[PDB]
Every structure is written in C-alpha cells, then in structure tokens.
Design an enzyme around this catalytic site. Sequence first.
Site, PDB file in Angstrom:
ATOM      1  N   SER A 108       0.841  -1.139   0.061  1.00  0.00           N
ATOM      2  CA  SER A 108       0.164  -0.097  -0.002  1.00  0.00           C
ATOM      3  C   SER A 108       0.964   1.066   0.126  1.00  0.00           C
ATOM      4  O   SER A 108       0.673   2.159  -0.765  1.00  0.00           O
ATOM      5  CB  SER A 108      -0.976   0.137   1.405  1.00  0.00           C
ATOM      6  OG  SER A 108      -1.349  -1.126   1.502  1.00  0.00           O
ATOM      7  N   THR A 109       1.857   1.194   0.945  1.00  0.00           N
ATOM      8  CA  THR A 109       2.922   2.407   1.358  1.00  0.00           C
ATOM      9  C   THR A 109       3.571   2.650  -0.017  1.00  0.00           C
ATOM     10  O   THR A 109       3.647   3.714  -0.318  1.00  0.00           O
ATOM     11  CB  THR A 109       3.527   2.141   2.140  1.00  0.00           C
ATOM     12  OG1 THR A 109       3.034   1.929   3.450  1.00  0.00           O
ATOM     13  CG2 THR A 109       4.598   3.150   2.543  1.00  0.00           C
ATOM     14  N   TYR A 169      -1.364 -10.487   4.820  1.00  0.00           N
ATOM     15  CA  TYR A 169      -1.330  -9.017   5.258  1.00  0.00           C
ATOM     16  C   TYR A 169      -2.924  -8.337   5.463  1.00  0.00           C
ATOM     17  O   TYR A 169      -3.755  -8.707   4.718  1.00  0.00           O
ATOM     18  CB  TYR A 169      -0.956  -8.072   3.828  1.00  0.00           C
ATOM     19  CG  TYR A 169      -0.914  -6.661   3.976  1.00  0.00           C
ATOM     20  CD1 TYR A 169      -0.947  -6.073   5.236  1.00  0.00           C
ATOM     21  CD2 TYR A 169      -0.795  -5.910   2.901  1.00  0.00           C
ATOM     22  CE1 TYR A 169      -1.009  -4.450   5.355  1.00  0.00           C
ATOM     23  CE2 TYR A 169      -0.766  -4.485   2.867  1.00  0.00           C
ATOM     24  CZ  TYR A 169      -0.940  -3.956   4.382  1.00  0.00           C
ATOM     25  OH  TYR A 169      -0.956  -2.410   4.064  1.00  0.00           O
ATOM     26  N   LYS A 180       1.135 -10.234   8.699  1.00  0.00           N
ATOM     27  CA  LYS A 180       1.416  -8.698   8.713  1.00  0.00           C
ATOM     28  C   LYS A 180      -0.152  -8.073   9.268  1.00  0.00           C
ATOM     29  O   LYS A 180      -1.093  -8.061   8.831  1.00  0.00           O
ATOM     30  CB  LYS A 180       1.617  -7.909   7.238  1.00  0.00           C
ATOM     31  CG  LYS A 180       1.751  -6.525   7.475  1.00  0.00           C
ATOM     32  CD  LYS A 180       2.303  -5.715   6.068  1.00  0.00           C
ATOM     33  CE  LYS A 180       2.399  -4.353   6.514  1.00  0.00           C
ATOM     34  NZ  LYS A 180       1.994  -3.507   5.189  1.00  0.00           N
ATOM     35  N   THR A 183      -2.062  -5.643  10.397  1.00  0.00           N
ATOM     36  CA  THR A 183      -2.216  -4.070  10.488  1.00  0.00           C
ATOM     37  C   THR A 183      -3.645  -3.706  11.213  1.00  0.00           C
ATOM     38  O   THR A 183      -4.646  -3.661  10.330  1.00  0.00           O
ATOM     39  CB  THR A 183      -2.122  -3.346   8.916  1.00  0.00           C
ATOM     40  OG1 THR A 183      -0.783  -3.689   8.628  1.00  0.00           O
ATOM     41  CG2 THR A 183      -2.497  -1.858   9.189  1.00  0.00           C
ATOM     42  N   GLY A 195       1.702  -3.704  12.371  1.00  0.00           N
ATOM     43  CA  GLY A 195       1.374  -2.692  11.340  1.00  0.00           C
ATOM     44  C   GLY A 195       1.246  -1.248  11.390  1.00  0.00           C
ATOM     45  O   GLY A 195       1.402  -0.492  10.513  1.00  0.00           O
ATOM     46  N   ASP A 219       2.559   2.067  12.956  1.00  0.00           N
ATOM     47  CA  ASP A 219       3.577   2.455  13.786  1.00  0.00           C
ATOM     48  C   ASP A 219       3.305   2.825  14.850  1.00  0.00           C
ATOM     49  O   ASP A 219       4.078   3.011  15.906  1.00  0.00           O
ATOM     50  CB  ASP A 219       4.432   3.477  12.817  1.00  0.00           C
ATOM     51  CG  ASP A 219       4.902   2.702  11.284  1.00  0.00           C
ATOM     52  OD1 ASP A 219       4.582   1.594  11.258  1.00  0.00           O
ATOM     53  OD2 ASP A 219       5.316   3.579  10.825  1.00  0.00           O
ATOM     54  N   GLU A 220       2.078   3.706  15.226  1.00  0.00           N
ATOM     55  CA  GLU A 220       1.678   4.723  16.322  1.00  0.00           C
ATOM     56  C   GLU A 220       1.545   3.563  17.489  1.00  0.00           C
ATOM     57  O   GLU A 220       1.210   4.440  18.603  1.00  0.00           O
ATOM     58  CB  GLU A 220       0.648   5.577  15.897  1.00  0.00           C
ATOM     59  CG  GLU A 220      -0.518   4.566  15.363  1.00  0.00           C
ATOM     60  CD  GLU A 220      -0.720   4.688  13.823  1.00  0.00           C
ATOM     61  OE1 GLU A 220       0.319   4.417  13.237  1.00  0.00           O
ATOM     62  OE2 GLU A 220      -1.745   4.438  13.281  1.00  0.00           O
ATOM     63  N   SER A 246       5.411   2.383   7.072  1.00  0.00           N
ATOM     64  CA  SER A 246       5.866   3.444   6.411  1.00  0.00           C
ATOM     65  C   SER A 246       6.836   4.373   6.997  1.00  0.00           C
ATOM     66  O   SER A 246       7.717   4.872   6.464  1.00  0.00           O
ATOM     67  CB  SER A 246       4.730   4.007   5.876  1.00  0.00           C
ATOM     68  OG  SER A 246       3.917   4.638   7.013  1.00  0.00           O
TER      69      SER A 246
END
Lengths: 296, 296, 296, 296
Positions: free
Chosen positions: D47-48, D137, D165, D167, D189, D191-192, D208
């Site tokens: 996606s990124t 994913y 994966k 997310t 998935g 990052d935050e 990302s």
Amino acid sequence: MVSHLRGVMPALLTPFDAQQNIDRASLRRLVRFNIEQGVDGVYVGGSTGEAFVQSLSEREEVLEIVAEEAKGKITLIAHVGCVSTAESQQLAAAAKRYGFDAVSAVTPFYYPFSFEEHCDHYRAIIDSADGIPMVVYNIPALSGVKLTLEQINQLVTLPGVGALKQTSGDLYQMEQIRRAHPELVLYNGYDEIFASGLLAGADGGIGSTYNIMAWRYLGIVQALKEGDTAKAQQLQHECNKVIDLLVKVGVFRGLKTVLHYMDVLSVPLCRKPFAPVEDKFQAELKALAQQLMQER
Amino acid sequence: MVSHLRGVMPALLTPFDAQQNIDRASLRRLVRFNIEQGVDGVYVGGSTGEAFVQSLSEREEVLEIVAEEAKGKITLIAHVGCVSTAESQQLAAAAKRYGFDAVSAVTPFYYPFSFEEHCDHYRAIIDSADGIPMVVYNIPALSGVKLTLEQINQLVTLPGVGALKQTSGDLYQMEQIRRAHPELVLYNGYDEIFASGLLAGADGGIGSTYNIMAWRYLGIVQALKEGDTAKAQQLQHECNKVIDLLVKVGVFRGLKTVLHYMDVLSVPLCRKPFAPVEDKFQAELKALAQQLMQER
Amino acid sequence: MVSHLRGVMPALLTPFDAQQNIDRASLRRLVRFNIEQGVDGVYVGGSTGEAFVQSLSEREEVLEIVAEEAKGKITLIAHVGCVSTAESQQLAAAAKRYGFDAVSAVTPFYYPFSFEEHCDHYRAIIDSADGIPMVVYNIPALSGVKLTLEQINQLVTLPGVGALKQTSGDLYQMEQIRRAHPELVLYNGYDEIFASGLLAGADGGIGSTYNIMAWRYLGIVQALKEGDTAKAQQLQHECNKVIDLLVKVGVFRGLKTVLHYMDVLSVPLCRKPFAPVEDKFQAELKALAQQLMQER
Amino acid sequence: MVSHLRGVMPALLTPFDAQQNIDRASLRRLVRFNIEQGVDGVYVGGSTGEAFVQSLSEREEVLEIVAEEAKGKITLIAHVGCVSTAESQQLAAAAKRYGFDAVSAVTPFYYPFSFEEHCDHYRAIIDSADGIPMVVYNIPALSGVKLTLEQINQLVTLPGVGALKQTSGDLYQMEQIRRAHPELVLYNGYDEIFASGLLAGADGGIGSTYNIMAWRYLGIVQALKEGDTAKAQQLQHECNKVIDLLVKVGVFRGLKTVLHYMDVLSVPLCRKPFAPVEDKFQAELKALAQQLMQER
Ligand SMILES: [Cl-]
Ligand SMILES: [Cl-]
Ligand SMILES: [Cl-]
Ligand SMILES: [Cl-]
Ligand SMILES: [Cl-]
Ligand SMILES: [Cl-]
Ligand SMILES: [Cl-]
Ligand SMILES: [Cl-]
Ligand code: NA
Ligand code: NA
Ligand code: NA
Ligand code: NA
C-alpha cells in the site's frame, strides 16, 4: 386479528414544565390535538416520549393520563421497553390495567444480549401484557442491535406478537419482511422516507413528526392508495423540508417548540442533557407553526 | 492533587439473590474480598455493576453499602452516570453524602447529544458532587459516542475533572492523551490489553475481571515498573486465557460464577434479560476458581 | 441539456471464456440482447463489469467492442474510474475516441483522499473526456467513501458533470438530492429498492440485474408513471425474489449463469478470486432462466 | 524455518519524478538509505509503495530494481497482492525470478469474497511463488475485510504461509494470535502503537514511517528486550509526535518530503489523486528532517 393496529400513529412527545417536571395539562391537550388530526392511534412512552430520561413511575403516569384522554377513541400503544425485563414487565402490566390495546418494547440495549435472550425478554413482557399484543420495535441506529432477516422472522412469529415497528432505512429488508409476512402490521419508522417505505411494504407508520403534521402523512397514504404518485412525492418533499429544519434545531425540542407556537404545549422543553432551542431558530419555527396552521 | 486516584480498581459487580433482588450480604463480602486483594480502590455502580438494569434507589443502596464497608480503607469511586442529567446529579449528591472520593459518569447515550450538551451534563454533575472530583468514562463500543482527541482534551480540563476512564482499544489515542496530559489519571478500561495500555500511557486500570484476579494486574504493574517485559506478557497471557472463557460464557455472569465457586457470592445471577450460565460451562468455571485460589 | 441520459441502463457484465480471457463473441451478443430488451442505454466497465480485475487495455477493449455494437442505437456510458487519476484519464480519452455519450468514475478508493482531491480527480477526468459529460458514481458500501449531502451538491455542480449514480439505500438523501437539483439525472443504484428509489426522486437506474430482466424495471417505471402502485410493488417483489437467489449464489456469476441458460453467454465464469457457482444451485438458476424467457 | 523473516522492515515508498513517472535513481538511493539504517528487510510494492495507482509492469519494475540493490544484503519481501488472483500470481512469479525471500498479498478488496475464496486466492499465489513463503497482510481499515480470529488461524496455517502482517489496532487479537501461534512471524502494522504491539505479541514490524526513523523502532525493540520500559515509551512518544505531523500533512507525501529534505529523494510527489503538500507545512517538514539527521 390485529388489523385494528394498522395505520398512522404519532410517537407522542412528553411535555415538561419549566422545571423539567411532566406538564400534565399540556400532555392532555397534545393527546386531544392528535386525536383531532384524525390519526389511527397514538404511541406512548417511546424514544420520542423521552422515556429513557424518565423513571418507571413517570412513565406509568404518562400511560395512565393518555389512556384517560384517549381509550376508546383511538388505538393506544404503550411502549413499555426498558433494558431490564422486570422493569418492562411492570410497565406492560400497568399498560394492561389502563386499557391499552397493545404494548411495544425496544430491543434491550447498552449491554450485548444474545438473540435468544432478546426472545425471552419479549416472551416475558408478552406474558405480563396479559393478552394484549406486542409490537416489536427495531431501531438499530439508536439501539446498536443489528438483527438479521431470519431473526426478525422469528420475532414476528413469537406467540403474542402482532406487529413490527421497523425503524430502518433499508427498504430491501422492508420488502423482504412484507413478502415473508403478508398479513403483518408493519410500521415505517423513519418519517423522512414514509412514502418510499409504504411502497416497499409498510402499511402504516409511527413517527415523531406526525405530532405537527399528521394530515400530510395521511395524505401520502391516500395518494398511494389512489395512484397519485406525484402527490405522494410532493407531500414527502414538504415533510422533508420540515425534517431538514428539525434536524438542524434538534428534533424533539423543535417539534415541541412548533407545538408551543400552535398553542398545544405551554412549555417546549426537553429534559437535560437536551439543551433548549437556540434563539436564532425561533423565527423559523414560529413561521413553520403558522404555515402548518394555515395549511389545515 | 488527585494522584490519590491512580491505580488498579475493580469495577464492582452487583450481587443479586435468587429472585433478582440485591444480595446485600454477598455485596459486603465482595467488597471485603477486593480490599484483601490489595487493590487501590473500587469502582461502584458502573456498567459492570449492572447499573442500567437497576433503579436510582437501588444504585444509591449499593453506593451506601460499599461506603460502609470500604470508606477510609481504599479509594471509592461512584459511577453516577445515567442518560438523565438530573438522575446523575441525584446519585452524585448521594455519593457525596456517603463519603465517596470521586464520582464518574458514562457519556450519556441512546439519544444523540452535541458535544456541548455532554460538557454541560458533566458540569452539572460536578456541581452536585460538591467538591469531589469527576472521572470522565469513555466506552465508545457500548455508548455509541465517538469523541475526538480534541473533545477528550476539553473534557479532561473541565473544572472538577480529575481523571479519564479510557475504555478504548485505540492505543495511539491513549498515547496522545498521555502526551497532552502528563499528570492525568488515566485508567485502562479493557482488561485484555492492560499491559499494552499501561505501556501506551495509562497509569492504572478499572476492570471487571479484577474482581477474580487482581493480583495478576498488580503484578503486571510491578513487572513493567521493574522492567520485566516477559513477566508482564506472561501475566497478560494468563489474564486473556481467562477473558477468552468469560467471553464464551458471558462476562458478568461468568465472573459472578467464579466468585461463587470462590465462596465470595452466594448466588451468581445477573438480572434479566441476561440468561443464567449454561450448565455445560460450570466445570470449566469451577476449575478456574480452584486454579485461581491455589495461585494465591 | 443531458436529459438524453435519463433512463434504465444495465450495468454490463464482462463475459469471460473458460480460461478467464474476455469472450468477445458473447460480449457482442450480450450488448445486442440488452438493446433488444428496450433499455435506454448501457453502462460499460463498471464494478459489475469486473473492471477491478481487468487491466486498462482489457477495459479499453471492452469499451471499443460495445461502442461498435451499440453506438447510435442506445446511450453509451463508459465507467472509466480507477484509483489513479492518470489511468482514469486514459480510459476517458479512449471512451471519447470510441464515441461514448458519457463517462463515469467511482470515487477513488482504498487510500483516503480529501474531498478536494476527489473534486480535482473528477475535474481531470472531465478534461480528458473532451466534452462528453461525467456521471458521478456513489457506492459508499464498496468504496468506503462516505460523502455528505453538501459534498454531493458540490460534485453534481462541477462543470462537466451531467448525472449522479446514487448507489445508496438512504432514500432521505435521494429525496434531498432531488429537491436540491430538480433537473439532475439521478440513477438508482440498488435494484432491490428500485420502485422506492424512483418514488424518492431517482428518474432512472443503472443496475446489474437489468441484464436478465430489464422489462420488469421498465414496467416499474411505467407503473409509477401511470399511478399503478400495486403493479410497481408486485414487479419489485418479483425482482427481489430473483435478487434473493442471486445473493445466495453470488450476484455476478449468478447473473452470468442465468444469461448462459438464456443462450446469451457461452461461458458464465467470473475472474478469480470469484469462485464458480456451486453445483447445487444450477437447477434453480436454470429454472429462473426458463421462467424469465417465458415471461417475455 | 522462516525465523529469518522476523524483524523491523520499512514499507518502501515508490519515488516518482516530476511527471509522475517512477524515479529509478531515487528508488535505488532509498533502498540504500534504508539498508544503512540497519533494518532487517524491506517490504516492496505494498500500500505504502502506492501499488494501487501503478500498473503491473510498473510494480515488476520496482521489484526488480530493489532486488538489484538489496538481494543478499537484507531480507526482501514482495507485496504482490492485487484484487485479481491472476495478476497477483504474475507478480509472485516475477518476485521469485528476481530472488525475493518472501511474497505478501493484501486480502483482495472492493468486491466481497467468501473466506474460502480468500484462501484459494492465497493458495494460488503461493503456488506461483514457487517455494518462497507467503506473508498474509491484514489491514481491515483500508481493505474493508474483517476476518475473525478463527479465520486468521486458518490463513496462517495454510501450506506456504510463513508470516502475518497484522495491520490492526486490536491488541487483544494480537495477543490471541501470538498465544495460538508461538512461532509465528507476526509484524505490527500500525507504527503509532509499535511498542504496545510488540508487548502484545508482535515480534517485528512493517511500517511506512521506518523510512525516515528506523533507528527509533530498532531502539524500541532493544529497550523492551533490555527491560527499559521508560525508554520504549519515550521513543514511542517521539515517533508519535512525528506521526501526528504526517497525518496532518498527508502520510506518504509527508514521508517523501522529509526524505527529500534528507537528500534521499530528488522529488517528493505522490501520484494523483494525492495532492502535493501544502506550502504552509514545508517549514515543519524541513525542520523535522534536520532534527532526524542530527539525532543520528
Ligand atoms: Cl425508563
Ligand atoms: Cl446505546
Ligand atoms: Cl439507572
Ligand atoms: Cl438507561
Ligand atoms: Cl482497472
Ligand atoms: Cl476498498
Ligand atoms: Cl496494481
Ligand atoms: Cl485496485
Ligand atoms: Na385505530
Ligand atoms: Na487508593
Ligand atoms: Na437513451
Ligand atoms: Na533480515
């Protein structure tokens, strides 16, 4: 044997006085006003009646007053639904004592319940209703309960269930319900799609905005019966111009304010945490009341 | 000046007897059991306490009993939240009379309210709490209320607000709240992510499953303080094996059943429309009670 | 000046051969079959055409073939929408070269785009369409894009936009769009509410099930024009009995299978990851084809 | 036998030149920059990487270039996922030819597919991958696909699947997956929530924002391994200050702009319909690049 429940019935508002206490005099006047609109029934103590910011004794008080004004003149449906089954049963037994023609209960909410728990909840209330029929009330938007077609089919065939209040904008499902149950009393719940909901299979409606303009919804029923497509659409257009404004100002308090300007309600307040209407909307709401009174 | 509110506090269950009446003797024993688990406080009359199938007088009764057993020994937080502001204020004033250390209120639900209506609701309850601090309680999954970060920031800085009960699985938002408010008392609400929620910024927790295994959650707090990553994960694993089972059987009634098998509650029933536990789960729940008692 | 776009238009399926390659001969026969149903137009390369499992060159190939069979005989609308603006522009320029009467594009999906990014996307495609009008295509269920009424109003007044494909079951919004835009070409997107969608303000429809029973939807249009409420409802009932079955079996492959049993398509496969129809449904689908052929 | 896939891997961005064509020189420099950050692998064409606004030949071009720079130096994972199974298989076969160590595919989207259709899609791609393992994913937020725990369990035990994966922000489910599959390679998935996701059971991450600050995420891994709770939280705080800004400006184009200010990418554009960065954000993004370069 419950075709006497079909038709157009306002979801009654509960008038409060200036200190948030029930306004009993304005309540009686509102019942009389709705009867004189030629409605088929009234639906008492629902969401629209602000049931969920009232105590059980306050709800019983409203049920009994409305029965005093309206028993025998129009159909009376008591919304007895609470989260608690025992609380709902108390209101059903009261509604029976006061001479209501049916009870209704929203799918119990906040807590997740299994479908079988929902059915047993309805079965318990039906038993307390002591022979008057039950209206299942479906309002997924507000209840958070998302029933399937097959679950709806099981609810409307429970012994003692005589109707479904379908507060859903999914008119595929409305048509499926009608096709599965050709004799079912099937109330359209969203006023803003009334004409389309009747076309999709509803044979009546229970709505908050009928309190201020029932003749328009009766006219939509008549237009579709007569085959006047364009008149049903024009009436729905006018209803939705009104609903647009009510959504802007807040629906219950907007309706109560219009009724106040029609000299029906002495005080148009909702209970907290509903705020009062903003002053900037008062002119529009008073103009609408004047328009509606002239239109009659 | 409200750091005394930080820590690990069970969301107290309300024991009922065989006829769905409050079981006052088992309630007092449950309070004492939780105190002897070494918890920092107890949270009374919340969702977990089956508040929304109780009357106001029943909720007041529970608040006063718990204060009688626990005032002065551990922190007492009273969940006074109702849909109605006036009903919430009555419970806040009662909680103040009984000597609670804080009140809490769920965002009012069922009806859509504007954000300013939510704030005025909290302001009114804070005033009735008469000087004890307010815990904002966020549980979007059950309330249907979906606040933004900026709205949360405005709520936690209302005068009189001393804490946030964050019943949300969004740990980005947990971290943002902590970063914006480094001194805020911030309770993790979902037991099944307790370790990760503490890492994301919570400094305590309010949870229903603490009633049966508070020492595990206290151990997670201690493990993260000591830097024992692997021990926090193993403890969370064990908590979630338990939560898996509770979700299967029904969480409140599963917890009450485990407490019954630990000789804490005489009768493990929830109120209708919650069904009783299915017989096929009893062996597993009794084995868990035995496991938990040996683990201490 | 785009009233020539109003009416009932099948969302064309793309026939594939036994190895998932385009079946050009069956494609031409499907176009001819739809023309001979008396439809007002055909809608090519949409979701229903399995556009999003085809390459750009495959989509262009389908557009050009359909224009070869149908230019001048019925209205041709090319769905040129991709996530990419540049890819959409290539298909718009191609559609212009092949003589289409309009282009259409789904709101770009997967990635979140701002509303202004959506508008610039449409503006770029309109420019490449080189003077033929744009149909905005709204399908929030599949796109994940949830536009407001005011954003819809801005899209339908973009220079070069001549119509809205409203694939939404919210018939309050359908009525609001019609009331705000009395001349707008407004296509009902969900076949299962066609009669109610027309009543709410749509003046036509684009639908996948029109490929097998367009005469029913034309009959609903005629019934509502004539004021035959009951005939529109009976026709919608029959459509939805069919849609019920198609949802059970898988809609695109069910439609292609019915068309195969009507001798329109040689091979009824969808592209992977769509599975073939289960053998247990074949009898029902063949019986439906026979029913539909006799009904004509 | 796929533990060599565990770790921290940037989701590679695809650099474009000023006319939206792939910038091959900046792509090679970005690969080299990420290698020199000490990452464990790179994740290409996700996606990124703006895969869904690229053609198949463009995606193959990117895969082959990255393999030329990075095969043998770090782990290479090729995201081959499309809606189409046949298109995904072409990219898997290409990834195999170019020497990738694994392939990955997003759950196919836009159209509803049954769970068995999803499994057969993965099985077909695995076969074309010709012996290199598959990464499932899961990104429900963007795909619209909402798998259950039991369906995830079936996917990660498909023959040829070597990793998941994840997310998803649901860290109860992360813990359940880890508890059910103690050897599974499990990528965080979002990052935050990286630190909390590792604590909940992930053993690595694909993200990302690792393109601009991988050392922070490697430092979080090291902090949790060492038992430095407070350092993991401080690093996550700093990551999220950055993510806050990226969400404000637009994440992909913000990352590309920061990389441009770090002299990694010549041109920081995304493809349309992504707009360029607003001029008012440039100062903040350049200051962040300078901060990040000094922090190393
Ligand atoms: Cl109530
Ligand atoms: Cl609710
Ligand atoms: Cl209550
Ligand atoms: Cl309530
Ligand atoms: Cl495409
Ligand atoms: Cl999507
Ligand atoms: Cl692609
Ligand atoms: Cl795509
Ligand atoms: Na009546
Ligand atoms: Na304490
Ligand atoms: Na035409
Ligand atoms: Na590696």
